């Protein structure tokens, strides 16, 4: 199917799309757009249907897939100042399209990367990730042990960046289990972190075999929380990564503790200081039976980036991280600026 | 310098869709300047811009985005030459709320006129068809009135409610309503006025109403 | 000679007019030249904040600020130029007599009126009734409403001449139960003139729920539809 | 009931522009009496 | 009429009447290498409101209604009829049309 746009109209993305066998439209969405507002017209990605014509600054717009369809990213977008959409493009999903492990592993680092080489200004050891494996007994041995072999790989990818980070191990079912707090002396020991990811068994919560998510994060908000005002907190970047199935049947509703996590870091709650590169959610669809729904409500909208995966096959990402380890390649240093105290005039 | 607009009237929140053509004297294609203005009803302008016909073909595609709380009325697409900022052209299009009616209605009287001493009156008739072509099938109320100059008279006794059967109908304005309509006994100072129809088709199902007039 | 050349036409329209929101990081900053005057330049913003304006150069323009929002002031209660009471009551299958008075507010008698009058799914009005009704004074209903049989008339069109504005020209009829099913759709019934549409007042009717309504939990002004099972 | 068309395979239209074909189309094709003659595939809405 | 021509008729064989979302051929027949700007109107937008309608009838129109000439024929003398024509007749003789300020004929 071929799109073409209206006189006077330019067309950005993909003007002919061929239907692939992954029951996704080959190419990029078509846009058909006049460049005549504050932001650029965030466009209707096939299988959408959008809301709002008004693309003024402050203005919003809203998105709503057919009906058997699950909308995969944001829901709402709101043009912000500086000519940029919030959120992230939507997505129309259905009950089969999954995701190649090359396709997950390469915008997972291409996200990741990024803001680590911000990271870089500059023990130690200034950024925490925060490992919530889901062991209940809704995912199987089979698909669990591959989420470990997974997550062992990517510790080895970030490692080949040459930084370190703490690490925080956490194993999830009727309650939650600390491998590694980011508090230890030995969180930003990636070999260590290793050691223990490798220890832990798909048998360690059979006994209580739970899901409840909702306690899972809250062991990561005594994580990175104070006993009450460090020095070093406004410049920590944290980062949240779990494999679930989004099967939650014990504690209710886990978005709670991210809103409560977003208070605890200080973020979104400042007009002129939203501090949103200080956070990121990534969800990784694990089990058998995966709810896009729930998965998606966890993760992170952040504009052309994505942190909701359904793995295909699994396992494959496993080879796929080790297959994309180059020590060859440089951690970019360019176009970088932070708010520093000081912020004498070439600081900025 | 021709402006033209996909529609004639358009719904706040829609897009106006509109082109220039850039003639010589000659109309002919031509490569030029021109300026494009947007007044709203009151006469304002809102939007304004610099553009050039040059190695386009004397075709300017252009679109003005309307607000959604923007204001209702007649609003104005104003466009002329750099080089001759006297000779002004325009074109209008109606803001409003609407919605698309289902059928038309058409209010064609025997005549095109009406002689005084006519006994017989002013006949007209009602044809109401679907936008398909298929008939309509319904009840009309058709009025009369009497307009001389910048202002109108209405006819409160020419009243009438025709059954519109096969997509067709059928009303006539006696004359002796007509001239009891105004007082002046005189029927010679009547000439040069003129007569307006006020038409209104319903549906037997009664989903849609349209008023037509003449 | 030389006068006719050092003499302007106008005086000097350069404004360098700046306006910064507490919401809004960067300043909005606009220019108004001589040729460029009279011309409608506005920023909106969806923030209630108190913002400043700073104005600078030589010349003279206007500003104005004014805010659009959907006040509180019903009040109304919008029935218009009319006031209509519906009522549906038992019967001496299910055979139920519909009752439909009105009034019109003003200082006439509304001239010719319209009644659409939509049927509980699964009723339909009695035709003798209606032959009743339409030989009736002031009262008119097209031949091709009344031959149509209990086949399909679940919606009526009853056209009227006139409608006082002091009483209540009240009317009824009868409506048999022609087709039994549970969970039935309340009526409805629409009255207005035949030039203005919008202008009317339109009343639903039903025999348990109350007023023609819908079950719905309300709360200050989020509603819930409740037309489901108990548990 | 036990015959008709599954309410769920039954694909409703939504398309109804007031307005469309905003195209343009140049006349190239080999001229014969002056007269340039192209032949266009649009495709109608939903609209009835 | 059109200086040149421009036609748009139906490309099918005629048949019956096209069905809601089907493909149908249009036929256009117009002058080489013009440029061909299309737009498709429903019908009942014209119920509300059918003025300012793009017509060849408005184009001569204008056209017509801005020529530098101005009398129907002839005039009151020799130096007349040329200016009421839109003509300035000069010679070395002397003989002269009238002089023309105004841009838009009289009255
Ligand atoms: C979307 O699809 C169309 C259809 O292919 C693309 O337009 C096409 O552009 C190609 C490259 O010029 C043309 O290919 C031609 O194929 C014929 C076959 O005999 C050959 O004789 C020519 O030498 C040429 O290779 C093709 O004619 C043209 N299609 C048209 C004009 O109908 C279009 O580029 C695609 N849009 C994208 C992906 O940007
Ligand atoms: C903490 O970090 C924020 C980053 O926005 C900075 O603005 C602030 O000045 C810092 N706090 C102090 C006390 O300097």
Redesign the pocket.
């Given at each position: 199917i071929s799109f073409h746009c209206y006189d006077g109209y330019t067309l950005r993305g993909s003007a002919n799309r061929t239907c692939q066998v992954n029951g996704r439209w080959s190419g990029q969405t078509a846009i058909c757009d006049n460049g005549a507002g504050y932001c650029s017209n965030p466009g209707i990605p096939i299988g959408t249907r959008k809301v709002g014509s008004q693309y003024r600054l402050e203005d919003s717009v809203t998105y709503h897939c057919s009906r058997g369809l699950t909308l995969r990213g944001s829901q709402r977008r709101t043009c912000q100042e500086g000519g940029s959409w919030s959120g992230t493009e939507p997505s129309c999903q259905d009950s089969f399209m999954y995701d190649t492990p090359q396709e997950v592993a390469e915008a997972f680092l291409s996200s990741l990367t990024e803001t680590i080489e911000g990271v870089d200004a500059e023990p130690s050891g200034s950024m925490n990730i925060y490992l919530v494996l889901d062991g209940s007994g809704s995912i199987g041995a089979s698909d669990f042990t591959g989420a470990k072999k997974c997550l062992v790989n990517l510790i080895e990818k970030v490692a080949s960046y040459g930084v370190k980070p703490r690490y925080g191990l956490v194993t999830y079912a009727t309650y939650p289990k600390i491998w590694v707090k980011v508090s230890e002396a030995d969180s930003s020991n990636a070999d260590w972190v290793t050691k223990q990811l490798n220890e832990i068994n798909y048998e360690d919560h059979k006994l209580k075999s739970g899901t409840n998510t909702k306690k899972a994060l809250q062991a990561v908000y005594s994580m990175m929380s104070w006993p009450d005002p460090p020095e070093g907190?406004?410049?920590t970047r944290h980062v949240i990564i779990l494999m679930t199935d989004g099967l939650h049947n014990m504690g209710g509703d886990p978005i709670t503790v991210i809103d409560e996590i977003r208070d605890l870091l200080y973020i979104g709650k400042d007009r002129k200081?939203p501090?949103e590169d200080y956070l990121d959610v990534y969800v990784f669809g694990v089990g058998p039976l995966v709810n896009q729904v729930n998965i998606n409500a966890l993760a992170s909208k952040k504009d052309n980036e994505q942190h909701v995966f359904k793995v295909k096959d699994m396992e494959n990402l496993e080879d796929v991280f080790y297959q994309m380890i180059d020590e060859s390649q440089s951690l970019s240093l360019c176009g970088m600026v932070w708010?520093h105290?000081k912020g004498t005039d070439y600081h900025k | 310098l021709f402006i033209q607009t996909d529609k004639t009237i358009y719904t706040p929140g829609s897009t106006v869709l509109y082109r220039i053509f850039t003639v010589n004297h000659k109309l002919l294609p031509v490569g030029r300047t021109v300026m494009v203005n947007i007044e709203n009803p009151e006469g304002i302008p809102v939007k304004q811009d610099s553009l050039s016909s040059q190695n386009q073909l004397g075709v300017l595609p252009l679109s003005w985005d309307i607000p959604e709380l923007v204001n209702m009325g007649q609003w104005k697409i104003r466009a002329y030459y750099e080089n001759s900022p006297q000779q002004v052209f325009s074109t209008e299009f109606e803001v409003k709320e609407y919605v698309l009616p289902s059928f038309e209605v058409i209010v064609e009287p025997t005549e095109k006129f009406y002689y005084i001493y006519n006994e017989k009156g002013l006949e007209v008739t009602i044809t109401a068809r679907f936008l398909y072509g298929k008939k309509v099938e319904g009840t009309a109320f058709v009025i009369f009135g009497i307009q001389d100059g910048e202002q109108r008279i209405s006819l409160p006794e020419s009243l009438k409610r025709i059954p519109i059967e096969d997509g067709s109908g059928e009303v006539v304005l006696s004359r002796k309503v007509l001239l009891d309509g105004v007082q002046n006994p005189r029927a010679e100072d009547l000439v040069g006025k003129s007569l307006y129809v006020s038409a209104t088709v319903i549906l037997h199902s009664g989903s849609d109403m349209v008023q037509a007039e003449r | 000679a030389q006068y006719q050349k050092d003499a302007p036409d106008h005086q000097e329209l350069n404004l360098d007019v700046s306006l910064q929101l507490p919401s809004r990081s960067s300043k909005i900053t606009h220019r108004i030249h001589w040729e460029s005057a009279s011309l409608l330049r506005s920023e909106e913003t969806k923030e209630n904040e108190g913002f400043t304006v700073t104005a600078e150069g030589k010349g003279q323009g206007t500003l104005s600020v004014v805010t659009m929002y959907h006040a509180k002031a019903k009040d109304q209660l919008t029935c218009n130029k009319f006031d209509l009471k519906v009522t549906i009551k038992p019967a001496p299958k299910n055979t139920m007599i519909l009752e439909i008075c009105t009034r019109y507010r003003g200082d006439q008698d509304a001239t010719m009126s319209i009644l659409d009058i939509s049927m509980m799914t699964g009723f339909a009005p009695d035709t003798d009734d209606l032959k009743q009704l339409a030989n009736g004074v002031d009262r008119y209903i097209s031949k091709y409403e009344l031959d149509k049989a209990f086949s399909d008339r679940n919606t009526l069109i009853i056209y009227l001449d006139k409608v006082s504005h002091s009483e209540d020209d009240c009317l009824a009829f009868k409506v048999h139960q022609y087709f039994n099913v549970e969970l039935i759709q309340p009526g409805a019934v629409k009255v207005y003139a035949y030039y203005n549409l919008e202008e009317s007042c339109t009343r639903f009717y039903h025999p348990e729920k109350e007023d023609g309504k819908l079950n719905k939990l309300c709360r200050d002004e989020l509603c819930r539809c409740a037309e489901e099972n108990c548990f | 009931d036990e015959d008709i068309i599954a309410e769920e395979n039954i694909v409703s239209r939504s398309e109804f522009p007031e307005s469309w074909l905003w195209n343009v189309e140049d006349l190239k094709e080999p001229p014969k009496n002056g007269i340039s003659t192209k032949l266009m595939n649009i495709f109608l809405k939903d609209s009835i | 009429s059109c200086v040149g021509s421009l036609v748009v008729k139906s490309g099918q064989s005629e048949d019956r009447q096209p069905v809601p979302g089907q493909q149908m051929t249009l036929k256009i027949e117009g002058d080489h290498g013009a440029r061909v700007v299309l737009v498709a109107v429903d019908k009942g937008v014209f119920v509300l409101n059918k003025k300012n309608k793009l017509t060849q009838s408005k184009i001569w129109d204008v056209v017509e209604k801005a020529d530098i000439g101005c009398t129907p024929g002839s005039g009151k003398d020799y130096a007349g009829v040329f200016s009421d024509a839109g003509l300035t007749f000069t010679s070395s003789s002397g003989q002269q049309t009238a002089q023309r300020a105004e841009l838009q004929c009289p009255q």
């Open positions: 907190w406004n410049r200081n501090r708010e105290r | - | - | - | -």
